[PDB]
Structures are given as C-alpha cells and as structure tokens.
C-alpha cells in the first residue's frame, strides 16, 4: 500500500480535519498518528533522485525537436 501520490496527501488533510472536529485520549488522534507514521516511513523510503526540473522541461523540448527532425529526414529519403 505504498506510493507517494497526491491522494495520500489529501488523505492526510482529511485525517487532520476529522481530528479537529472530534476534539483525555483520542481514537481519531491515534488514527492521525498512524497516518503521519505512514507518511514518515514513505518519506524515509524516499530517495532524492534529483535532476533539474527546469532542465527536465528543456530536454523534453530539444529531444522533441530531435524526434521531429528524425521523422522529417526519414520521410525525406523515402520520398
């Protein structure tokens, strides 16, 4: 049950809200603490895996320029 997506964020926020509205000891808080535990372990398993997201965009575009030129040249010889 592990993936670090937006949906489990919204899960977190909904847990927070439900805690606030619930408010000695709390069965909603302990559910919240399980949730933050899960997200903590999900971020601990997390790996940085970073190359520049701006560079990412740029190489998407120049690579796409490559591909378009490839198909242009290929169809050029086939004609």
């Amino acid at each position: 049950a592990e993936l670090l997506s937006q949906q489990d964020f919204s899960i977190l926020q909904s847990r927070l809200l439900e805690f606030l509205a619930s408010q000695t000891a709390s069965k909603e808080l302990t559910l919240l603490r399980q949730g933050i535990r899960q997200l903590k372990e999900k971020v601990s398993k997390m790996e940085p895996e970073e190359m520049t997201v701006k560079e990412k965009k740029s190489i998407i575009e120049i690579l796409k320029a490559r591909i378009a030129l490839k198909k242009a040249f290929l169809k050029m010889a086939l004609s």
Partner: protein
C-alpha cells in the same frame, strides 16, 4: 586379384584425342564468350556502383551534420 578387378574397373577409351580435343575447343570458346558478357556487364556494374556511392556520400555527411 586386386590387379585383375582394377583391370575390370578400367574403362575402355579411344587412344585418339579428336573427341576430347573438340570438347576442349567448345569449352574454350564457351568460357571466352561468357567472359566477354561478364566484362560488359561488369563495366556497367562499376559505373552504377560509383553513382550510388556518390548518393551515399551526400547522405552520410548531410545526416551527420543535421542531426549533430
């Protein structure tokens, strides 16, 4: 016994070479004309090869430059 059986293995042949000689001359003429045909078609071949080679060369330099 082996010599005898080999003598039987021996096929009789005319000592005269006229039949063989004529065969020989036919083969020589034959390979001569086939060699001429090969020569004509071979010159045309090499000309063709030069043409395609030029088109190749254009392709190679163009492709390299443009993609890189």
């Amino acid at each position: 016994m082996q010599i005898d059986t080999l003598i039987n293995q021996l096929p009789g042949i005319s000592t005269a070479p006229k039949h063989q000689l004529e065969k020989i001359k036919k083969l020589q003429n034959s390979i001569e004309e086939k060699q001429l045909e090969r020569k004509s078609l071979e010159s045309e071949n090499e000309d063709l090869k030069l043409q395609l080679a030029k088109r190749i060369e254009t392709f190679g330099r163009l492709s390299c430059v443009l993609f890189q």
